[PDB]
Amino acid sequence: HAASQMAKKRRSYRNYGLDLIRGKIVDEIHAGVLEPTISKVKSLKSALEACVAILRIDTMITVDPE
Amino acid sequence: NATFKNKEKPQEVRKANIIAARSVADAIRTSLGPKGMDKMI
Ligand SMILES: Nc1ncnc2c1ncn2[C@@H]1O[C@H](COP(=O)(O)OP(=O)(O)O)[C@@H](O)[C@H]1O
């Protein structure tokens, strides 16, 4: 990818994922490794929404219960 | 000189209140401004 985004021109080829079963980099679109955009788009926007609300935490007052 | 003594002294109760009270506005100080941080209770 670091390279592909050099003319991203030649024959641009991201979509290069991991093929752990064999242990090599392959084109996942070809190989058949598909995932809906809607996931990784919410999976991301969300996970940070957490990290930030926590990044702001600097004092944790824990009241005594009953 | 030699005049009025004030036998009584809960002078300390005041300074005691102030200190046990100022300690409150302490825990808060950190959350003032665009650099203020939130508390988690
Ligand atoms: N742009 C800024 N630069 C410097 N001070 C600011 C800026 N914007 C608001 N502040 C300061 O943030 C201070 C504290 O705000 P906050 O921490 O929300 O407590 P409160 O607003 O309840 O006093 C405000 O008194 C204001 O002076």
B38 and A61 Cβ atoms separated by less than 8 Å: no
- This entry's atomic model was obtained through X-ray
DSSP state letter for A47 = H
Query: What Å resolution does this PDB entry report?
Result: 3.8
Q: Using an 8 Å CB-CB cutoff, list chain A residues near B41.
A: 60-63
Q: Using an 8 Å CB-CB cutoff, list chain B residues near A57.
A: 37-40
Separation CA B14–CA B16 (nearest Å): 5
Atom of ligand 1 nearest to the CA of B31: 17
- Please, what's the largest Cα pairwise distance for chain B? 57
DSSP string covering chain B, please?
Answer: ----------HHHHHHHHHHHHTHHHHHHTT-STT--EEE-
Across chain A, where does the E strand assignment appear?
A: 16-19, 24-27, 57-60
Question: How open is the CA angle A32-A27-A11, to the nearest 5 degrees?
Answer: 135
Burial class of B39 by CB neighbour count within 10 A (0 to 12, 13 to 18, 19+)? middle
Give how far the C-alpha of residue A49 lies from the chain's centroid of Cα atoms, to the nearest Å.
15
Find residue A24's DSSP bridge partners. Answer: A19
Find residue A27's DSSP bridge partners. Answer: A16
Phi and psi at A39, nearest 5°, equal: -80, -75
